[PDB]
Design a protein around this motif. Structure first.
Motif, PDB file in Angstrom:
ATOM      1  N   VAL A   1     -32.322  14.299 -11.685  1.00 58.72           N
ATOM      2  CA  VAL A   1     -31.330  15.348 -11.460  1.00 58.72           C
ATOM      3  C   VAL A   1     -31.991  16.737 -11.466  1.00 58.72           C
ATOM      4  CG1 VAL A   1     -30.462  15.606 -13.863  1.00 58.72           C
ATOM      5  CG2 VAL A   1     -28.905  15.996 -11.921  1.00 58.72           C
ATOM      6  N   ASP A   2     -31.455  17.665 -10.656  1.00 61.04           N
ATOM      7  CA  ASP A   2     -31.944  19.040 -10.573  1.00 61.04           C
ATOM      8  C   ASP A   2     -31.507  19.803 -11.829  1.00 61.04           C
ATOM      9  OD1 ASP A   2     -33.167  19.328  -7.712  1.00 61.04           O
ATOM     10  OD2 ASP A   2     -31.164  18.524  -7.264  1.00 61.04           O
TER      11      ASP A   2
ATOM     12  N   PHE B   1     -18.577  26.590 -22.382  1.00 55.67           N
ATOM     13  CA  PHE B   1     -17.605  26.632 -21.278  1.00 55.67           C
ATOM     14  C   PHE B   1     -16.206  27.029 -21.741  1.00 55.67           C
ATOM     15  CE2 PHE B   1     -20.939  23.628 -20.022  1.00 55.67           C
ATOM     16  CZ  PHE B   1     -21.229  23.988 -18.726  1.00 55.67           C
TER      17      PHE B   1
ATOM     18  N   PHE C   1     -12.090  21.817 -17.366  1.00 52.84           N
ATOM     19  CA  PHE C   1     -12.467  21.685 -15.954  1.00 52.84           C
ATOM     20  C   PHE C   1     -11.274  21.548 -14.999  1.00 52.84           C
ATOM     21  CE2 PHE C   1     -15.899  20.034 -18.658  1.00 52.84           C
ATOM     22  CZ  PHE C   1     -16.877  20.964 -18.370  1.00 52.84           C
TER      23      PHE C   1
ATOM     24  N   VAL D   1     -15.465  28.280 -16.078  1.00 48.23           N
ATOM     25  CA  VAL D   1     -15.305  27.256 -15.046  1.00 48.23           C
ATOM     26  C   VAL D   1     -13.973  27.434 -14.280  1.00 48.23           C
ATOM     27  CG1 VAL D   1     -14.357  25.377 -16.508  1.00 48.23           C
ATOM     28  CG2 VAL D   1     -15.785  24.801 -14.520  1.00 48.23           C
TER      29      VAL D   1
ATOM     30  N   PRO E   1     -23.172   4.638 -14.227  1.00 49.55           N
ATOM     31  CA  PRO E   1     -21.838   5.014 -14.743  1.00 49.55           C
ATOM     32  C   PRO E   1     -20.709   4.302 -14.003  1.00 49.55           C
ATOM     33  CG  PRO E   1     -23.209   6.966 -14.446  1.00 49.55           C
ATOM     34  CD  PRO E   1     -23.929   5.830 -13.783  1.00 49.55           C
TER      35      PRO E   1
ATOM     36  N   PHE F   1     -17.121   5.933 -11.014  1.00 53.63           N
ATOM     37  CA  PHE F   1     -17.691   6.919 -10.091  1.00 53.63           C
ATOM     38  C   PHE F   1     -18.803   6.358  -9.194  1.00 53.63           C
ATOM     39  CE2 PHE F   1     -16.095   9.049 -13.935  1.00 53.63           C
ATOM     40  CZ  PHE F   1     -15.085   9.796 -13.380  1.00 53.63           C
TER      41      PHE F   1
ATOM     42  N   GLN G   1     -19.553   5.897  -5.176  1.00 49.71           N
ATOM     43  CA  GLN G   1     -20.874   6.261  -4.650  1.00 49.71           C
ATOM     44  C   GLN G   1     -21.859   5.115  -4.771  1.00 49.71           C
ATOM     45  OE1 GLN G   1     -21.929  10.678  -5.688  1.00 49.71           O
ATOM     46  NE2 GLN G   1     -20.873   9.855  -7.477  1.00 49.71           N
TER      47      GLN G   1
ATOM     48  N   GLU H   1     -29.198  10.542 -21.239  1.00 48.73           N
ATOM     49  CA  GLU H   1     -28.333  10.289 -20.084  1.00 48.73           C
ATOM     50  C   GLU H   1     -28.730   9.013 -19.321  1.00 48.73           C
ATOM     51  OE1 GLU H   1     -25.342  11.777 -19.230  1.00 48.73           O
ATOM     52  OE2 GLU H   1     -25.505  13.008 -21.049  1.00 48.73           O
TER      53      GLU H   1
ATOM     54  N   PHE I   1     -30.663   8.593 -15.746  1.00 45.38           N
ATOM     55  CA  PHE I   1     -30.965   9.977 -15.356  1.00 45.38           C
ATOM     56  C   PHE I   1     -32.096  10.588 -16.179  1.00 45.38           C
ATOM     57  CE2 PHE I   1     -26.528   9.199 -14.221  1.00 45.38           C
ATOM     58  CZ  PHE I   1     -26.431   9.703 -12.942  1.00 45.38           C
TER      59      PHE I   1
ATOM     60  N   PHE J   1     -29.104  20.599 -17.196  1.00 43.43           N
ATOM     61  CA  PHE J   1     -29.462  22.011 -17.287  1.00 43.43           C
ATOM     62  C   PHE J   1     -30.793  22.187 -17.991  1.00 43.43           C
ATOM     63  CE2 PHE J   1     -24.811  22.221 -16.993  1.00 43.43           C
ATOM     64  CZ  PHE J   1     -24.587  23.315 -16.189  1.00 43.43           C
TER      65      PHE J   1
HETATM   66  C1  RFP Z   1     -18.959   9.896 -15.931  1.00 43.09           C
HETATM   67  O1  RFP Z   1     -18.955  11.264 -15.573  1.00 43.09           O
HETATM   68  C2  RFP Z   1     -19.818  11.559 -14.455  1.00 43.09           C
HETATM   69  C3  RFP Z   1     -19.125  11.224 -13.096  1.00 43.09           C
HETATM   70  C4  RFP Z   1     -19.726  11.686 -11.959  1.00 43.09           C
HETATM   71  O2  RFP Z   1     -19.300  11.532 -10.637  1.00 43.09           O
HETATM   72  C5  RFP Z   1     -18.514  12.636  -9.961  1.00 43.09           C
HETATM   73  C6  RFP Z   1     -18.270  12.192  -8.525  1.00 43.09           C
HETATM   74  O3  RFP Z   1     -17.208  12.847 -10.667  1.00 43.09           O
HETATM   75  C7  RFP Z   1     -17.263  13.999 -11.411  1.00 43.09           C
HETATM   76  C8  RFP Z   1     -16.270  14.387 -12.295  1.00 43.09           C
HETATM   77  C9  RFP Z   1     -15.037  13.530 -12.474  1.00 43.09           C
HETATM   78  C10 RFP Z   1     -16.445  15.548 -12.997  1.00 43.09           C
HETATM   79  O4  RFP Z   1     -15.457  15.888 -13.863  1.00 43.09           O
HETATM   80  C11 RFP Z   1     -17.615  16.361 -12.838  1.00 43.09           C
HETATM   81  C12 RFP Z   1     -17.803  17.547 -13.593  1.00 43.09           C
HETATM   82  O5  RFP Z   1     -16.861  17.982 -14.526  1.00 43.09           O
HETATM   83  C13 RFP Z   1     -18.952  18.335 -13.450  1.00 43.09           C
HETATM   84  C14 RFP Z   1     -19.952  17.974 -12.540  1.00 43.09           C
HETATM   85  C15 RFP Z   1     -21.152  18.790 -12.368  1.00 43.09           C
HETATM   86  N1  RFP Z   1     -22.251  18.550 -12.989  1.00 43.09           N
HETATM   87  N2  RFP Z   1     -23.365  19.396 -12.735  1.00 43.09           N
HETATM   88  C16 RFP Z   1     -23.828  19.577 -11.363  1.00 43.09           C
HETATM   89  C17 RFP Z   1     -25.364  19.509 -11.325  1.00 43.09           C
HETATM   90  N3  RFP Z   1     -25.944  19.191 -12.625  1.00 43.09           N
HETATM   91  C18 RFP Z   1     -27.393  19.053 -12.567  1.00 43.09           C
HETATM   92  C19 RFP Z   1     -25.512  20.178 -13.629  1.00 43.09           C
HETATM   93  C20 RFP Z   1     -23.984  20.241 -13.741  1.00 43.09           C
HETATM   94  C21 RFP Z   1     -19.783  16.796 -11.777  1.00 43.09           C
HETATM   95  O6  RFP Z   1     -20.778  16.467 -10.906  1.00 43.09           O
HETATM   96  C22 RFP Z   1     -18.624  15.961 -11.911  1.00 43.09           C
HETATM   97  C23 RFP Z   1     -18.401  14.738 -11.190  1.00 43.09           C
HETATM   98  C24 RFP Z   1     -19.205  13.956 -10.172  1.00 43.09           C
HETATM   99  O7  RFP Z   1     -20.318  14.216  -9.689  1.00 43.09           O
HETATM  100  N4  RFP Z   1     -19.052  19.483 -14.297  1.00 43.09           N
HETATM  101  C25 RFP Z   1     -19.162  20.765 -13.945  1.00 43.09           C
HETATM  102  O8  RFP Z   1     -19.145  21.126 -12.797  1.00 43.09           O
HETATM  103  C26 RFP Z   1     -19.334  21.724 -15.055  1.00 43.09           C
HETATM  104  C27 RFP Z   1     -18.622  23.034 -14.870  1.00 43.09           C
HETATM  105  C28 RFP Z   1     -20.059  21.461 -16.167  1.00 43.09           C
HETATM  106  C29 RFP Z   1     -20.828  20.209 -16.422  1.00 43.09           C
HETATM  107  C30 RFP Z   1     -21.499  20.054 -17.577  1.00 43.09           C
HETATM  108  C31 RFP Z   1     -22.407  18.862 -17.987  1.00 43.09           C
HETATM  109  C32 RFP Z   1     -23.729  19.031 -17.234  1.00 43.09           C
HETATM  110  C33 RFP Z   1     -21.756  17.489 -17.641  1.00 43.09           C
HETATM  111  O9  RFP Z   1     -20.529  17.320 -18.341  1.00 43.09           O
HETATM  112  C34 RFP Z   1     -22.690  16.289 -17.979  1.00 43.09           C
HETATM  113  C35 RFP Z   1     -23.201  16.328 -19.449  1.00 43.09           C
HETATM  114  C36 RFP Z   1     -22.088  14.915 -17.656  1.00 43.09           C
HETATM  115  O10 RFP Z   1     -21.083  14.562 -18.656  1.00 43.09           O
HETATM  116  C37 RFP Z   1     -21.483  14.773 -16.207  1.00 43.09           C
HETATM  117  C38 RFP Z   1     -22.551  15.158 -15.163  1.00 43.09           C
HETATM  118  C39 RFP Z   1     -20.943  13.308 -15.973  1.00 43.09           C
HETATM  119  O11 RFP Z   1     -22.091  12.397 -16.017  1.00 43.09           O
HETATM  120  C40 RFP Z   1     -22.143  11.439 -16.980  1.00 43.09           C
HETATM  121  C41 RFP Z   1     -23.387  10.594 -16.880  1.00 43.09           C
HETATM  122  O12 RFP Z   1     -21.244  11.306 -17.834  1.00 43.09           O
HETATM  123  C42 RFP Z   1     -20.277  13.046 -14.611  1.00 43.09           C
HETATM  124  C43 RFP Z   1     -19.058  13.938 -14.412  1.00 43.09           C
END
Ligand code: RFP
Lengths: 530, 543, 542
Positions: free
Chosen positions: A9-10, A151, A469, B23, B479, B482, C25, C160, C163, C482
């Protein structure tokens, strides 16, 4: 085929910030002359904050008598908490609601004061004897700003944030006997608070508006099974529970287990207190008991019959000049002379032990009984109430002197453990139309399952959408149609008139979480979604 | 000020930054939840089947299925108690189906296994001293158990991500079918209890609750579901095969005992207290009544096979190589202290090794009560294990035994309890003894996985945060909801379309009764299916 | 009963995010496998295990679990394993490639990171079978049966799952495990033949991990937090961590030092590990020497012992302290005696005395004619966790003007050697807070200061742990997705070090616990960048 990367991941560069744990001293004001602490947070570098923790310095308790603090003393101290700016209240909670929101958090509960040092009932023998040593408790004031850490954090757009903490009287947080000088303690006691929070210095902060759930509670009249929450326009949830009312009593109870808080611990403490008067080893008929007391000598068979109930009493090493006696009516309740009698002695089936010649007392081995959590929760006043045609309390003066005052402000149901469910039916109406109804506590089962809690309430959740969110899903109002209020009606479970617990006054508590929009345009302000 | 000068100077603009302090609050799909409760249709190999039909234009989606059960008032004579987590033990099979067929289904034990890490769900199903302790009835109208209501959380794949994972009703009729186990399975009772009448009078009274969602303009997309399948191997056989494996997310392996060769009677049971020590202490307490006897002359009421020896002045009684120290205080002058040297014994040959329960005791201390005319034991030193408490009474008196076996009093034998719990694992009540010495999983001819230690169980317990896991091979670390789950893919041409499990069982002593406890190998496979909501809900096996 | 009319009417142009359906996906094509490997054992002649991971199939890995084969312990004497034996075995763990160390942790720090994981702790060895003190009666008697323990080596690659996993870009990964001496993990008495046990004992390790065979892996760089610890000089209230350029957190705690003792303690509770269990075990050990039922003055006690006959009223006065002793069924030929100075300590004659017998107020029981011993019923005392944590050596130290240990030879022979390497504070439960003030300096400027353990309260709240430390967290940003937030150095201004100064509270010189040595531990987590360009390598952030 196009594939989503699950192995890399980036690593996004976040907002440049720096956290700091900031601790502040308050301003104490006695305003009903209730203790109020105010904490002013104003600094150009404190950009945002969350995780409010209130510490309290408990004093050294010296003197005579029995004294102990209620479990989770720190939470019980709190009457109300308000977070406000120049534009008004941003968020506020009632003491009990903050506690309810932290009941699942074992760490927060431990920090607030849950130890044998604080919660066990200690005894002081001389006027200069130390009953309790000074200690510091920490109360996690859980706010909606902690949900998603940075957040969700409270942003301070060059505004002055005031945190006001209203304290409950020290009577509420203390368990004591008549011997203890509470009068002096109440005069001498002062709340010593300190507010800590995680502050964030953020470089070039990009503020966006957010949503907050603010809890509102409505308490119904004494023994009224209805309660209404007016002006409901966007609610995320609705909780319904019962609280006992002990205003009709002196708030005195026979026993208390202390730090050990299980249902069995409450029962065992009660049994232990009664056993002193229940089985007596004496030379001739025992003395120091009221005339109403029916103390019967145990026959050779060991069986003493109290109507249809048989009590097997067998004590070893009894002196030749002495006999074994059983108090057949230690505590009794009856509304009429020809009615069912609730006798505590009848709740015992077997009592075994050995008399000690050295200490001149009985050492009980095994007790077979049917004592429940309700028996331990009956206030002493209800045993000797006007409704009772009997004396009621046939215990010794020595036992009656050991009775403890319990004024815990967060008791639920009709027992100390909130074990007994007294709601036979629940009806919730939005306006005049039935929104939800149930005959079983299925809303409580769902609350306990969804929140992974063992101590839940009958809760109607409208928001199943992820927090921060997303904008929360709410039950929306229709003023034109009349649907702008939530009316709760309960049917209390029917108890037998001859049981002392039937006379415990009840109060219905309805908690509504209304949705508000957080605006940072020229200072922090909230707006009710309508 | 409040912020330290060092922090201020360290902070006080060229790089693009992701906002971690705010956000955009996205507007979600407009919906409204409701807790809906429904009554069923009862049907009767004369097994109870409850059917719940969910069909409404406004119930767009659903999840969190909870089945409530009204347990009746139990009146009469004898000993009676419910098995722990009674609500789960009631379930034989659950099925969620539409007009196109079964959408998802599970076996009773597998639902329980999936909920074993949920303390709340387990408590709700019936886990209290009121239900699980062994209560006694003294008169034909004496209440043994008060009526109670238990709640069973039917965990389904629709709960994983709440609204996102929910079962979408494409204006179709959903039927929830619940098959119940016989009441014999959920009840622990003695001979004195009138089970014959209880079985006739008992009726399952179920009610299905679920969180229903009324969704405005729902945008349905296809999803993926994991459906569990189990295969039970032949009695005492160390092999089992799951055929037609095409796309599996996981594979679990465990053992179950088989008590068909016994009357399902056991000497003791601890009740609500379910620790290994509680099971042991209950057993010791039951034996102590006949083990150490304070009597005037040789004790009576014991079979001729019994060898009750008077305790000498030194307190040591020698049973072959084993020395038992017995010292009882306040013994009357007319009476003596006696030790039962062969309370329970087993052997296959006239002069071979003997497994004697009395030999498992090293020290017994106590005081005789003149008032109650009984011994009050203080401290007991013994080597009784969880296996001893788990031996059915039938095996002590089996044809293999050259001895009588059960040399207890008639009073003790009458207190024996029938235990028919359907979800027992291993060869003991706690599943403590690991009887699998080696595990091999073969995907065709080739070895997919092999282990000598339960490292697959350690990984299961660590990854699922559970204290009671099984030897599990997980193929999906992606996961859920998703993403499309990762599976072990089959090669039909190479004959890699079946998972074969072979175990090496531990070798036990023939003169120990646990040797005769029949074992069954259980292999659970989770197959991937695609949920198609195109004109009614339907599932398709990934092949 | 179906959807209510009120809800239907409430529902019956704005863009809405779908919360009821999602596009499943297609993930990266991969296949996991639980791989177990045997090591290469090497030999203060410390045991070192090396595990080499290099395979074309193994593209990535995580969830390292180290299993250990504990041998059958046969012979005489008392023996038991320390709780969480598996973690206590670990001295250091390092994960390295051809380019050097990728990540490494000290034994105690790995344990500290797993203290909030009940499952990981149970797996490592926490049972009555392992942790209770068992006794061997004959040279061929089995004290402890052979058992296998599993140690979860928590790494940043598990955060994670896939990841965060460690990617092996055609590089050879070596996992090096350094073991503590067997003395550290074992609780034994003098009767036990530790000399032979130490010679015969061999660590039998096996490394397991979840390996992933990934088809066309798309590698991206990541960030890792590497912990560093600095142990201050004995009893010195200061410690410094140099070269601090980008740190995510800083932890401060205290450890006792028992090098000045023979590491012998009077009692140990075993598997039962509560504060009350430690106290009850100590009381139980003292009771047989404290109250004696004998025909005439008791024998087998040193001349220094002052054993007084209990009077008719039951009260024995030891200066200002009154002890009530009442024993039932005492033979007519025998009397009840109280040891008035079982354990005593003082640095000056005719001054303040710390007497353990004075900590008792009431003792009741019944004498057994059959076993010729007293069976105690109820004990009223003021024994604390500190008393149970005092090494025996300090009671008989040169500082003591008294004999100190006035117990019987039978009691002294039952004393146990405890060498647990992960003890914190000055007691076995880390109950007593000995830090009165904490000062943290970044360079020369004050970064943080506290008088109360509010940093420990925040650590316990944020990590949902019951056993936390004074921790300063700088990173509140989500991990893996991050780049972590850190403290920033300024080499020009001299701000490239973290200096810790504590103010310890002082004990009473006439209390044996004053003589327990202290050590300050400072743990710093530095940020490193993980690069996979021509092998796996890490680079410290400046
Ligand atoms: C099971 O959950 C997964 C389902 C994914 O599939 C998919 C299709 O559905 C998603 C849902 C339903 C989300 O609600 C979501 C989201 O709220 C979010 C980001 C964006 N993430 N980022 C974009 C780039 N990244 C490098 C940094 C931040 C997302 O991409 C998603 C997302 C998807 O992509 N959040 C944000 O934008 C903001 C404002 C903050 C985020 C903070 C931290 C970083 C995250 O909470 C980390 C700790 C993880 O908890 C998540 C990444 C979950 O991963 C896991 C393994 O649990 C993921 C939602």
């Amino acid at each position: 085929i196009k594939r989503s990367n699950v192995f890399a991941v980036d690593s996004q560069i976040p907002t440049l910030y720096m956290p700091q744990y900031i601790s502040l001293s308050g301003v104490m004001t006695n305003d009903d002359n209730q203790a109020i602490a105010s904490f002013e947070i104003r600094d150009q570098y404190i950009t945002a904050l969350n995780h409010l923790v209130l510490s309290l310095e408990l004093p050294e308790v010296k003197g005579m008598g029995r004294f102990g603090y209620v479990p989770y003393v720190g939470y019980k101290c709190i009457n109300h908490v308000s977070i406000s700016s120049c534009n008004g209240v941003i968020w506020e909670i009632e003491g009990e609601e903050l506690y309810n929101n932290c009941i699942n958090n074992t760490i927060a509960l431990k920090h607030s004061g849950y130890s044998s040092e604080l919660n066990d009932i200690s005894i002081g023998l001389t006027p200069n004897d130390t009953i309790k040593e000074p200690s510091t408790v920490y109360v996690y004031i859980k706010t909606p700003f902690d949900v998603e850490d940075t957040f969700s954090s409270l942003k301070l757009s060059d505004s002055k944030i005031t945190v006001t903490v209203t304290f409950n009287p020290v009577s509420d947080i203390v368990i004591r006997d008549s011997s203890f000088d509470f009068e002096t303690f109440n005069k001498e006691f002062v709340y010593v608070p300190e507010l800590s929070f995680i502050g964030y210095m953020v470089k070039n902060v990009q503020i966006k508006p957010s949503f907050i759930e603010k809890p509102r509670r409505v308490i119904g009249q004494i023994n009224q099974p209805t309660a209404t929450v007016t002006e409901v326009h966007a609610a995320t949830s609705l909780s319904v529970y019962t609280k006992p009312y002990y205003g009709n009593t002196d708030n005195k109870f026979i026993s208390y287990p202390g730090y050990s808080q299980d249902e069995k611990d409450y029962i065992d403490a009660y049994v232990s207190r009664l056993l002193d008067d229940l089985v007596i080893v004496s030379d001739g008929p025992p003395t120091g008991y009221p005339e109403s007391a029916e103390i019967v000598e145990v026959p050779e068979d060991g069986i003493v019959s109290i109507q249809d109930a048989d009590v097997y009493v067998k004590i070893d090493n009894v002196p030749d000049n002495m006999s074994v006696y059983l108090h057949t009516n230690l505590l009794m309740f009856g509304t009429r002379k020809n009615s069912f009698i609730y006798n505590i002695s009848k709740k015992f089936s077997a009592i075994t032990g050995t008399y000690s010649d050295a200490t001149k007392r009985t050492i009980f081995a095994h007790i077979s009984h049917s004592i429940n959590i309700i028996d331990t929760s009956i206030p002493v006043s209800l045993w000797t109430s006007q409704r009772n045609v009997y004396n009621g309390d046939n215990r010794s003066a020595e036992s009656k002197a050991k009775d403890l005052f319990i004024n815990d402000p967060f008791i639920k149901g009709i027992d100390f453990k909130n074990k007994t469910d007294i709601i036979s039916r629940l009806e919730v109406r939005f306006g005049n139309d039935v929104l939800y109804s149930e005959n079983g506590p299925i809303s409580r089962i769902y609350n306990e399952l969804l929140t992974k809690s063992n101590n839940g309430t009958r809760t109607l959740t409208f928001n199943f959408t992820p927090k921060i969110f997303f904008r929360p899903t709410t039950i929306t109002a229709n003023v034109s149609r009349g649907k702008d209020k939530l009316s709760v009606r309960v049917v209390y479970s029917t108890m037998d008139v001859n049981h002392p617990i039937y006379y415990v006054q009840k109060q219905l508590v309805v908690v509504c979480n209304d949705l508000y929009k957080v605006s940072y345009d020229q200072g922090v302000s909230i707006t009710k979604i309508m």
